[PDB]
């Protein structure tokens with residue numbers, strides 16, 4: 245089991261850390277959601293699906309910077325939503341193919357004015373936890389999520 249990003253970096257077998265850079269809607273109003281879709285950013289696969297089933301959770305999602313100070317909301321993981329920043333580990337998603345499969349995570353963030361997220365800033369850290377039905381591997385793939393652009397909340 246290993247993963248790759250839309251910015252051309254990787255995390256190999258056994259886990260590790262990578263940076264992800266997301267383009268964000270430049271304007272989000274109060275009462276609206278800013279969507280941060282990681283399924284277009286993070287892709288993973290199973291290295292031996294003939295015999296091994298991989299299980300993948302969002303272990304913890306943490307907020308930083310302007311997201312931490314100016315937003316609340318949810319994380320949607322494989323079709324169900326939970327508070328973000330997270331308060332539990334999600335259910336598992338199965339990875340059962342060598343073919344790249346998106347990691348089905350998206351943040352829905354709503355403003356609690358002006359530049360609310362600064363370009364280049366860290367907005368979130370998402371920990372992907374991978375186990376399997378084969379051995380006792382239990383690995384963390386740590387994704388540091390950065391904004392590529394400013395996000396403005398109008399008055």
Ligand SMILES: CNS(=O)(=O)c1ccc(-c2ccc(O[C@H]3O[C@H](CO)[C@@H](O)[C@H](O)[C@@H]3O)cc2)cc1
Pocket residue numbers: 245246257258289290291292293296297298375376378381
């Ligand atoms: C080379 N001979 S073989 O066909 O029998 C063979 C080759 C590779 C493997 C192999 C076993 C464990 C592996 O472990 C990783 O990949 C798993 C499947 O994605 C993960 O569950 C593990 O955590 C680990 O990343 C990867 C490849 C097994 C058999």
